[PDB]
RNA sequence: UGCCUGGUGUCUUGGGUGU
């Protein structure tokens, strides 16, 4: 049931590399992540995300 | 504030009178309904106690 | 080739309101009763009172998009110091021998008074004026 | 809220070509060039360089809207010359001018250092 | 000493190669 | 209070500027009024 | 609130000249002479230091919320 | 102190210069030739004190059309500044604080007692009056 | 409150801004508003591919869609659908797609005094959060960009879209039935720049002419021959303006009985869309009747007339951008030779008023029939003072050079008039409250700084100074009284006029 | 401070603004047409006085009903090497060519008002309705409709 | 054919005269130096603790404006063009700041000298905040009183001034040509006489004033340009000029490559 | 195999914004 929803994530590629966000929408292959840095929400592919875990940053295998 | 209200309005209460010199601001007043009815004390004015 | 030719002596030069434009009034030396009122650009062709100007009017410069002239080609304008191109917006067939031709070179106005015989051929849509000094 | 990203002024999308050329058939030997993610810096340089070539009879450019980073240029040469060759010659000539300018500035700076 | 203590003729020698009433010197605490 | 160094410096500058203004503005006004009188 | 890092108009860095400006004013130099001594030529830069009001000295007087 | 009813019976001078008897820029004082002589009883402390708190911010209010003075008096109460120095410890429904307030370069003497120098509500911008690109019409 | 007028759906509201680079009948719509509003488009075999693309894009990507409506009326929300790509569209369904370019929308500003306050524009989606208008339409809306807001209403049907595009469209509303004259004309700095650009001594080089010609959308690709061919090719501003005018337009106007040689460059003569002489200003491209806009609308139709605004605005705006125009404090100043004339005129008027006062006080004053002695005296004094202000203002105006910026703005008709020059430079004049001079609010005097029974001009509200020179405290107070009267009169008459118009409409 | 309210129409970068010979670009450009009809001469006088004050390091005294005249400020401005009326020769940002008209130029005190567009923009397709009348509710905060 | 003549030279500003170039080329060079020369500036701030009276984003904005040495920024890569997951040492520079006030009296000033470079590209002279001298404390960042601490970690990236003004290497580029107005490119507003009402240009002595009897020359073009380049210290003046020229060359070469590959 | 949510008072009053 979209386990990565409402989880802190970091962007590793594209024009937003290294920005912390929170996943809001998880329909599929296109995740809506709100950014902490500006006040906006952007779409992003799943391959571009690094989901936070108990041990550092983990790629899209959470 | 001048409690004359809106009903039965007239231009004379809203006008800036000669005797207002030095006691209320000639420039500062709201816009619309309360124009002229709301006044601001001049910068050296006082009220007797 | 050329539709009119004469030599004029400048009577008056009026700058007036403007800085780059002058009104000059001239009468033909060979024939009085021919007048020329003209707007000119001061900065390019400055004139003074009592100057002598050779004025020529032609309907073509030969011997539609405008192009910068190549240095190799030659045209009628090679012999003159000031060439303008304008449209004739009035041909007053006036009294017995009083004919007025009004020409506007993009807002710079010219009026040519003269007899019918001299200005008969000037009934064209567009005219070049060629001034030499 | 509706403000676009600032990097869109110079970062080119993959599907958008940097340079699209379409002929202008109203007059002979004329082309219309659409530059993407460019502004007056390149446009004015190219225009004033091309205006001096004897074989270029019309060159102009315009920026349609300040809020979009692109400009469109109209070029029209003589019968002998293809316009794209004239554009390439202009680019190469400006590059050589900049190169000699850099060399001379370096020489002067070393002298006055 | 200061410019005032200078001789008037020597003050005349000080020529630029007067205060105005509407140029105040800035403050930070104001008053009231 | 134990005011900071910047605040103390600002207070000294303010006192000096107040004195200088009170002197110079008054002098300039006195210079101008006599000229306006004699005209 | 606190001296801006860059001049708004042109972009010269004026944030490192506040302390020097106050030191110069302390010694009796006039404001124009103090600004000239710091090499602030354009009046766009001069208005940044001349018209700055230092409010952080008032915010710091409140007791810190943590310890 | 005089009130609005005692003012009916007094003769006031506008400035201390009025107590005693060809430039294209300076203004013109009233001639007052109807009276052979005057016996003033009071003098105004300063005429610019007839203005209120909001109208004491305008510089050169006597060079302006009066409706513009009224509009500025209205709009000066909507300018974001620093309303108080303890805005951190206050819980207001709304609060707007300007990052870098600056005091005006052209100030008035009445701004000293309104603390406008210490809690200003604006900035000095380099303004150019021009028809540049048609986007400021 | 609920039947004659009610709140409605499918509408938006935000601040308006100006855009010189928009056609006359175009409005700039923010992206967020375009995403929020929608238009239900019926799926047919001409647009099923495009509509499927829109459905795939979803409600967050532009162009996109918000809902899919089946034949039975059920709504499929695309936010909460996990299988949006697994939706196939059948003919007859509706897709509530996003607002797109060239969609007709009704645009409105309150109060809606006349029918030109609601007009239909074409949508153009733009960044940032303000509605954007071509500045020629700011006149019918009575709108400016100091904070005004305007309303947008989206049609929701093919019939309603056709009605908006065929009846309320902006090009169809250029000429009004109220006074059979255009309601939209060239305004503000475009008017000022078309006056400056069409002066007799404005010449343009080849490289600038090429740029100016490329800016005209309707240009046919042929450069006109320059007015001056030798020694240097130069074009005049009239040529570049005539480039923007459609061919086949004839316009003739006589200003002050000028001859066909037009020594002062006044009047007008446009032959086959080419300007022969005459400076183009408010009398030609303004909103008055019989001008260029009215002629083009009658001759060529609403579409060409709408394109005329864009052509003229683009050319003039480019020229004025690369030429410049400003105004300064030096433009409100008159030399000493004129200031002494103004002072002498004002002193003479004050002496005349003093003589009238003496004559009235010694019963030597003639009485105007139907008016008392006091009324006749007051009328004569008011007339004398008004004539004084007019004379001083005329002297100041005649002083001004051609390069004066205020004079240029007044001459173009873009902004200001003669009274503004008079008051800024020469004399503010007499302040009238309720049609009379300043009354005696105190006991037999206007202020406690005057002696009793003083009828001198300065004692009853005659501001002798100018705005540049500055007002004395008494003049300041009297002028404030007059301004307060103006504000009150406006704020009171507006309600009476609104009631009258409502009764008339009912 | 003279009733000259307005809204931002567009933002240009540093290199697109007109600049003076010494590299100063304005923070803000206003139309000349704002002045003549409204007759806010105090705006121009304040700009001139502020220019002189920032050049000389003083604060101008703009108290009303004083003896300050425009000619004194102009003399002070001329003594500092600027045009006495405040004009400046200014260059075009796009092409670098001089502008044919000189530009009035100087610092002025501006203030930011509470009315921002992002607090006023509002749109509605469908949403809550009143219980009594089943018409759209009133208010931007409540996702209401327009009347 | 183009010529360069340097009038004054310094580490932070150079005053030079260009000649035998078109006005468009000089203006394009000025624009490129203003807004297209890449530099290095702080672009992400991770605030681990901030108990000062300033807001977190206030301090972040202040940090972004601090100039950093960008001498070897050419070797560095753009963040969006680096294939590395997260940020590596080849596309970012990590600086760390830690400030604290000890004692129950006094105020501590936090300067840009306290920014300590932690990681960055190997042997590249980038990232260090610019200092006027060895004893210059730098830009004032914040102020602290007792028990107030600021502990942040900042990441610097490469960018241009088009994206944000913090990446601009220049402050103000004075630009000027034709001091005596022989080309009549401007028309002088005046009240009595235009000659004595307008101040002379600072380069008026570098060109001969027109003769009283001289006629207007319609064949002349602007030929000599006087321009002064001031920098913020991140790049030297000569580096700014040379890199602006190189950036313009790269842009033109890219256009040429696009044209040649279009066919 | 553990499986995802749309539902928002009312009435007064005040202060404002654009005409
Ligand atoms: Mg408005
Ligand atoms: Zn600066
Ligand atoms: Zn990397």
Look up residue I253 and give its DSSP letter.
E
Beta bridge partners of K129: K68
**Structural domain containing residue A13:** 2-61
What residues of A are in contact with residue K80 (Cβ under 8 Å)?
Answer: 14-15, 17
| C1’ L15 / CA B13, Å | 22
| C1’ L3 / CA A4, Å | 14
Q: How far is I82 from chain A (nearest CA, A)?
A: 6
Neighbours of chain I (3+ CB pairs under 8 A): A, B, C, D, H, J, K
Residue I96 CB partners (closer than 8 Å, separation 6+)? I38, I39, I40, I41, I65, I66, I67, I68, I69
Neighbours of chain A (3+ CB pairs under 8 A): D, I, K
What residues of I are in contact with residue H47 (Cβ under 8 Å)?
Answer: 473
CA distance between the termini of chain C: 20
In a 10 Å sphere around its CB, with 0-12 CB exposed, 13-18 middle and 19+ buried, how is residue K160 labelled? buried
Query: G46 among the known binding-site residues?
Result: no
Look up residue I436 and give its DSSP letter.
B
Give the C-alpha distances (Å, rounded to integers) separating C2 from C5, C58, C98, C128, I230.
Answer: 7, 4, 22, 9, 17
Question: Closest partner residue to D66 among J10, J15, J121, by Cβ?
Answer: J10
What residues of I are in contact with residue D6 (Cβ under 8 Å)?
Answer: none
**In terms of domains, do K63 and K159 share one?**
yes
CA distance between the termini of chain F: 55
Q: How far apart are CA I312 and CA C66, in angstroms?
A: 22
Domain count, chain K: 2
Residue I12 contacts residue I33 (beta carbons within 8 Å):
yes
| C1’ L1 / CA I68, Å | 32
Contact F25 E24 (CB under 8 A): yes
Taking each helix axis as running N to C, give the angle between helix I373-399 and helix I336-361, from 0 to 180 degrees, rounded to the nearest 10.
170
Give the rounded distance of the alpha carbon of H82 from its chain centre. Answer: 20
Q: Which of I447, I484, I490 to mutate to test the interface with B (most CBs of B within 10 A)?
A: I484
CA A46 / ligand 3 centre spacing (Å): 20
Residue D78 token pair: 């003589």
CA nearest to K28 within chain J: J95
Residue H131 contacts residue I189 (beta carbons within 8 Å):
yes
Residue K93 contacts residue K120 (beta carbons within 8 Å):
yes
Q: How far apart are CA D44 and CA D94, in angstroms?
A: 12
Contact K215 C44 (CB under 8 A): no
| C1’ L4 / CA D75, Å | 60
Which ligand has the shortest distance to the CA of H126? 2
By DSSP bridging, strand C99-105 and strand C82-93 are antiparallel
Beta bridge partners of J87: J104
Helices (H), D24-72: 40-50
Contact K26 J15 (CB under 8 A): no
H50 touches chain J (CB under 8 A): no
Q: Could you check whether the bond before residue I111 is cis, i.e. omega within 30 degrees of 0?
A: yes
**Structural domain containing residue C33:** 1-133
Look up residue C70 and give its DSSP letter.
P
Q: How far apart are CA H5 and CA H8, in angstroms?
A: 6
**Structural domain containing residue D91:** 1-113
Domain termination site, one of K165, K198, K217: K165
Output phi, psi for K113, to 5 deg.
-65, -25
Half-sphere exposure at residue B37, Cβ-oriented, CA atoms within 13 angstroms: 15
Give the C-alpha distances (Å, rounded to integers) separating I270 from I205, I240, K76.
Answer: 23, 13, 63
Domain-by-domain residue ranges, chain G?
1-66
Domain count, chain A: 1
G40 touches chain J (CB under 8 A): no
Residue G64 contacts residue K100 (beta carbons within 8 Å):
no
Query: K88 among the known binding-site residues?
Result: yes
Largest CA distance in chain F: 55
Residue F24 token pair: 């110079």
- List all residues of chain K from 132 to 171 with a beta carbon under 8 Å from chain A: 155
Contact K53 H88 (CB under 8 A): yes
| C1’ L15 / CA D49, Å | 62
Q: How far apart are CA I142 and CA K55, in angstroms?
A: 43
Beta bridge partners of H79: J113
Q: How far apart are CA C50 and CA I106, in angstroms?
A: 68
Q: I366-404 burial, b if ≥16 CB within 10 A, otherwise e?
A: eeeeeeeeeebbbebbbebbeebbbbbbbbbbebbeebb
Domain termination site, one of K165, K195, K217: K165
Q: How far apart are CA G67 and CA K100, in angstroms?
A: 12
Query: G39 among the known binding-site residues?
Result: no
Looking up tokens 């313009």, which residue turns up? Answer: K248
Look up residue I444 and give its DSSP letter.
S
| C1’ L11 / CA I110, Å | 28
Residue C109 CB partners (closer than 8 Å, separation 6+)? C37, C38, C39, C102, C103, I261, I262, I277
Q: How far apart are CA K89 and CA K91, in angstroms?
A: 6
Contact E21 F25 (CB under 8 A): yes
H104 touches chain G (CB under 8 A): yes
Q: How far apart are CA J110 and CA J89, in angstroms?
A: 24
Residue A32 contacts residue A25 (beta carbons within 8 Å):
yes
Report the nearest residue to nucleotide L18, CA vs C1'. Answer: I148
Largest CA distance in chain H: 65
**Structural domain containing residue K224:** 1-38+166-263
Identify how many contiguous H helices and E strands chain B contains and give both numbers: 1, 0
The sign of the CA dihedral I8, I12, I16, I22 is negative
Q: How far apart are CA I315 and CA I325, in angstroms?
A: 16
Could you tell me which of H133, H130, I421 has the C-alpha nearest to residue J104? H130
Q: Which nucleotide is nearest to I143 (CA to C1')?
A: L19
Residue K148 contacts residue K42 (beta carbons within 8 Å):
no
Q: How far apart are CA J15 and CA K105, in angstroms?
A: 47
Q: How far apart are CA D51 and CA K4, in angstroms?
A: 24
Domain count, chain C: 1
SS3 state of residue I207: helix
User: Residues contacting strand L at CB < 7 A?
Assistant: A 1-2, 5-6; B 1, 30-32, 34, 38; H 74-75, 78; I 80, 110-111, 142, 144, 146-149, 491, 494; J 5, 115, 127-131, 137, 142
Query: K170 among the known binding-site residues?
Result: no
Q: How far apart are CA I345 and CA I392, in angstroms?
A: 7
Look up residue K174 and give its DSSP letter.
E
Cβ neighbour number for residue I62 with a 10 Å cutoff: 14
- Which CATH class for the G1-66 domain? mainly alpha
What residues of C are in contact with residue D27 (Cβ under 8 Å)?
Answer: 65
SS3 state of residue J42: helix
Neighbours of chain G (3+ CB pairs under 8 A): E, F, H, J, K
Could you tell me which of I262, I321, J103, I316 has the C-alpha nearest to residue C18? I262
Q: How far apart are CA H49 and CA J64, in angstroms?
A: 10
The CATH number of whichever domain residue D67 belongs to comes to: 3.30.1360.10
Contact I213 D60 (CB under 8 A): yes
Q: Which nucleotide is nearest to I494 (CA to C1')?
A: L19
Which ligand has the shortest distance to the CA of K90? 3
Output phi, psi for K202, to 5 deg.
-70, -15
Give the C-alpha distances (Å, rounded to integers) separating I431 from H137, I455, I478.
Answer: 32, 14, 7
Give the rounded distance of the alpha carbon of A5 from its chain centre. Answer: 9
Q: How far is K199 from chain J (nearest CA, A)?
A: 6
CA nearest to C46 within chain K: K215
Q: How far apart are CA D62 and CA D42, in angstroms?
A: 12
D14 touches chain A (CB under 8 A): no
Q: How far apart are CA H113 and CA J63, in angstroms?
A: 14
Q: DSSP secondary structure string, J63-82?
A: -SSSS--HHHHHHHHHHTTS
In a 10 Å sphere around its CB, with 0-12 CB exposed, 13-18 middle and 19+ buried, how is residue I315 labelled? buried
Q: Which of J13, J17, J119 to mutate to test the interface with D (most CBs of D within 10 A)?
A: J13
**Chains I and H share 3 or more Cβ pairs within 8 Å:** yes
Residue I73 token pair: 């009326």
Cβ neighbour number for residue I10 with a 10 Å cutoff: 21
Contact I30 D2 (CB under 8 A): yes
């Amino acid at each position: 049931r979209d386990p990565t929803l409402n989880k802190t994530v970091k962007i590793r590629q594209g024009g937003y590399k290294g920005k912390i966000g929170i996943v809001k929408e998880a329909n599929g292959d296109r995740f809506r992540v709100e950014l902490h840095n500006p006040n906006k929400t952007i779409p992003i592919p799943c391959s571009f995300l690094l989901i936070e875990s108990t041990h550092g940053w983990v790629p899209y295998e959470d | 504030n001048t409690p004359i209200g809106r009903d039965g309005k007239l231009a004379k209460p809203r006008q800036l009178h000669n005797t207002h010199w030095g006691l209320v601001c000639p420039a500062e007043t709201p816009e619309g309904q309360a124009c002229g009815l709301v006044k601001n004390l001049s910068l050296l004015s006082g009220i007797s106690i | 080739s050329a539709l009119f030719d004469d030599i004029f002596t400048v009577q008056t030069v009026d700058n007036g309101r403007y800085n780059k434009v002058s009104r000059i009034i001239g009468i033909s030396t060979t024939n009085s009763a021919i007048k020329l009122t003209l707007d000119i650009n001061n900065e390019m062709f400055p004139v003074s009172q009592d100057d002598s100007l050779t004025v020529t009017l032609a309907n073509s410069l030969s011997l539609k998009s405008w192009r910068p002239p190549k240095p190799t080609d030659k045209s009628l304008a090679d012999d003159y110091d000031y060439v303008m191109f304008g449209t004739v917006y009035k041909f007053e067939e006036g009294d017995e021998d009083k004919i007025k031709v009004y020409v506007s070179f993009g807002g710079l106005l010219m009026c040519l008074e003269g007899g019918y015989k001299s200005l008969a051929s000037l009934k064209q849509d567009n005219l070049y004026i060629l001034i030499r000094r | 809220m509706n403000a676009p990203d600032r990097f869109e002024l110079f970062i080119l999308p993959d599907d958008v070509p940097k340079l699209k050329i379409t002929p202008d058939s109203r007059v002979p030997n004329c082309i219309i060039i659409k530059f993407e993610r460019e502004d007056h810096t390149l446009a004015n340089l190219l225009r004033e360089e091309l205006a001096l070539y004897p074989d270029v009879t019309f060159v102009a450019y315009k920026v349609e809207h300040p809020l979009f980073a692109n400009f469109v240029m109209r070029l029209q040469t003589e019968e002998g010359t293809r316009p794209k060759q004239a554009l390439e010659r202009a680019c190469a000539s400006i590059i050589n001018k900049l190169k000699t300018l850099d060399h001379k500035f370096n020489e002067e700076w070393n002298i006055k250092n | 000493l200061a410019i005032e203590n200078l001789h008037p003729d020597d003050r005349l020698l000080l020529v630029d190669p007067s205060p105005v009433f509407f140029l105040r010197r800035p403050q930070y605490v104001s008053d009231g | 209070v134990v005011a900071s160094k910047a605040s103390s410096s600002m207070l000294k500058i303010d006192q000096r500027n107040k004195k200088l203004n009170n002197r110079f503005i008054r002098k300039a006004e006195m210079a101008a009024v006599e000229k306006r009188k004699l005209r | 609130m606190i001296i801006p890092v860059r001049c708004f108009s042109c972009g010269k860095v004026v944030g490192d000249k506040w302390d020097a400006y106050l030191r110069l004013l302390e010694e009796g130099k006039q404001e124009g002479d103090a600004l000239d001594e710091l090499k602030l030529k354009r009046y766009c830069c001069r208005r940044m230091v001349l018209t700055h009001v230092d409010l952080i000295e008032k915010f710091l007087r409140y007791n810190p919320l943590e310890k | 102190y005089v009130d609005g009813e005692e003012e009916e019976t007094i003769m006031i001078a506008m400035t201390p210069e009025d107590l005693q008897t060809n430039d294209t820029a300076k203004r013109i004082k009233p001639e007052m030739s109807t009276s052979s002589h005057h016996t003033f009883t009071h003098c105004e402390i300063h005429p610019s004190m007839i203005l209120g708190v909001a109208a004491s911010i305008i510089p050169f209010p006597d060079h302006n059309q009066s409706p513009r003075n009224t509009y500025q008096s209205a709009m000066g109460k909507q300018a974001m500044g620093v309303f108080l120095t303890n805005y951190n410890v206050r819980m207001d429904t709304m609060a707007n604080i300007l990052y870098y307030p600056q005091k005006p370069l052209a100030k008035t003497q009445a701004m000293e007692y309104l603390k406008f120098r210490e809690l200003p509500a604006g900035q000095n911008a380099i303004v150019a009056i021009a028809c540049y690109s048609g986007y400021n019409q | 409150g609920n039947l004659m007028g009610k709140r409605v759906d499918f509408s938006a509201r935000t601040v308006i801004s100006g855009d010189p680079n928009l056609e006359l009948d175009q409005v700039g719509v923010p992206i967020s508003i375009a995403k929020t509003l929608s238009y239900p488009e019926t799926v047919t075999q001409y647009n099923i591919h495009r509509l499927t693309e829109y459905v795939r894009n979803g409600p967050n990507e532009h162009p996109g869609a918000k809902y899919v409506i089946r034949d039975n009326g059920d709504r499929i929300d695309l936010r909460y659908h996990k299988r949006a790509g697994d939706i196939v569209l059948q003919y007859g369904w509706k897709v509530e797609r996003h607002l797109m370019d060239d969609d007709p929308v009704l645009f409105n500003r309150q109060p809606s005094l006349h029918k030109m306050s609601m007009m239909a524009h074409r949508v153009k989606v733009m960044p940032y959060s303000t509605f954007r208008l071509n500045l020629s339409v700011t006149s019918p809306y009575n709108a400016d960009f100091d904070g005004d807001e305007m309303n947008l209403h989206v049609p929701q049907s093919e019939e309603t879209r056709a009605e908006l595009s065929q009846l309320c469209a902006v090009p169809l509303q250029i000429v009004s039935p109220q006074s059979n004259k255009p309601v939209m004309g060239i305004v503000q700095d475009t008017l000022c720049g078309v006056r400056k650009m069409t002066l007799r001594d404005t010449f343009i080089e080849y490289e600038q002419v090429m740029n100016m010609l490329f800016w005209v959308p309707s240009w046919d690709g042929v450069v006109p021959q320059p007015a001056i061919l030798k020694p240097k090719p130069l074009w005049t501003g009239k040529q570049l303006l005539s480039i923007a005018i459609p061919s086949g337009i004839h316009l003739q106007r006589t200003d002050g009985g000028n001859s066909l040689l037009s020594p002062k460059d006044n009047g007008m003569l446009i032959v086959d869309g080419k300007v022969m002489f005459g400076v183009v200003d408010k009398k030609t491209v303004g909103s008055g009747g019989g001008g260029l806009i009215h002629t083009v609308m009658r001759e060529k139709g609403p579409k060409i007339c709408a394109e005329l605004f864009g052509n003229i605005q683009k050319v003039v705006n480019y020229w004025l951008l690369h030429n410049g125009f400003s105004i300064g404090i030096g433009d409100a100043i008159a030399d000493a030779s004129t200031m002494k004339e103004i002072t002498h005129a004002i002193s003479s008027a004050k002496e005349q008023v003093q003589e009238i006062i003496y004559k009235a006080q010694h019963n030597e004053l003639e009485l105007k029939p139907g008016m008392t002695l006091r009324e006749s005296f007051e009328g004569e004094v008011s007339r004398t003072l008004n004539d004084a202000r007019d004379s001083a203002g005329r002297s100041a105006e005649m002083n001004l050079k051609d390069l004066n910026n205020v004079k240029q703005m007044v001459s173009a008709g873009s902004k200001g008039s003669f009274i503004n020059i008079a008051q800024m430079s020469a004399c503010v004049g007499q302040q009238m409250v309720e049609g009379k001079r300043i009354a005696f609010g105190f006991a037999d005097r206007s202020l406690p700084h005057f002696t009793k029974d003083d009828f001198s001009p300065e004692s009853k509200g005659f501001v002798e100074n100018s705005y540049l020179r500055g007002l004395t405290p008494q003049e300041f107070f009297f002028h404030a009284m007059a301004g307060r009267e103006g504000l009150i009169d406006t704020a009171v008459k507006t309600a009476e006029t609104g009631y009258i118009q409502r009764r008339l409409v009912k | 401070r003279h009733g000259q309210k307005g809204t931002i129409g567009v933002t240009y970068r540093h290199e697109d603004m007109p600049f003076s010979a010494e590299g100063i670009v304005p923070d803000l450009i206003i139309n000349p047409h704002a002045i003549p009809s409204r007759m806010t001469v105090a705006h121009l006088i304040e700009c001139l006085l502020s220019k002189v004050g920032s050049i000389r390091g003083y604060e101008g005294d703009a108290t009303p009903f004083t003896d300050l005249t425009v000619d004194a400020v102009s003399n002070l401005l001329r003594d500092n090497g600027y045009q006495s009326r405040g004009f400046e020769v200014m260059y075009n940002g796009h092409t670098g060519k001089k502008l044919m008209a000189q530009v009035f130029f100087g610092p002025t005190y501006y203030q930011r008002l509470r009315h921002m567009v992002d607090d006023k923009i509002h749109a509605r397709a469908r949403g809550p309705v009143q219980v009594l009348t089943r018409q759209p509710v009133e208010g931007r905060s409540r996702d209401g409709g327009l009347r | 054919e183009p010529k360069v003549n340097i009038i004054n030279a310094q580490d932070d500003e150079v005053e030079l005269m260009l000649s035998d170039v078109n006005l468009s080329l000089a203006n394009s060079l000025r624009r490129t130096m203003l807004a297209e020369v890449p530099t290095l500036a702080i672009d992400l701030v991770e605030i681990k603790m901030n108990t000062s009276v300033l807001a977190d984003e206030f301090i972040s904005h202040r940090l972004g404006l601090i100039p950093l040495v960008s001498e070897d920024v050419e070797e560095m890569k753009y963040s969006r063009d680096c294939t590395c997951e997260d940020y590596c040492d080849e596309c970012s520079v990590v600086l760390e700041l830690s400030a604290r006030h000890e004692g129950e009296e006094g105020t501590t000033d936090v300067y840009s000298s306290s920014l300590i470079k932690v990681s960055g590209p190997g042997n590249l002279n980038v990232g260090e905040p610019v200092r006027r001298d060895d004893y210059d404390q730098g830009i004032l960042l914040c102020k602290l009183r007792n028990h107030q601490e600021l502990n942040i970690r900042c990441i610097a990236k490469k960018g241009i001034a088009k994206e944000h003004a913090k990446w601009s290497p220049c402050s103000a580029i004075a630009f000027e040509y034709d001091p005596h107005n022989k080309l009549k490119h401007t028309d002088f507003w005046f009240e009595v006489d235009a000659k004595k009402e307008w101040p002379d240009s600072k380069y008026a002595t570098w060109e001969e004033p027109p003769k009283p009897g001289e006629v207007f020359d319609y064949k002349a073009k602007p030929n000599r340009f006087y321009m002064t380049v001031e920098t913020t210290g991140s790049l030297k003046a000569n580096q700014v000029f040379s890199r602006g020229i190189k950036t313009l060359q790269e842009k033109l070469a890219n256009v040429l490559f696009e044209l040649e590959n279009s066919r």
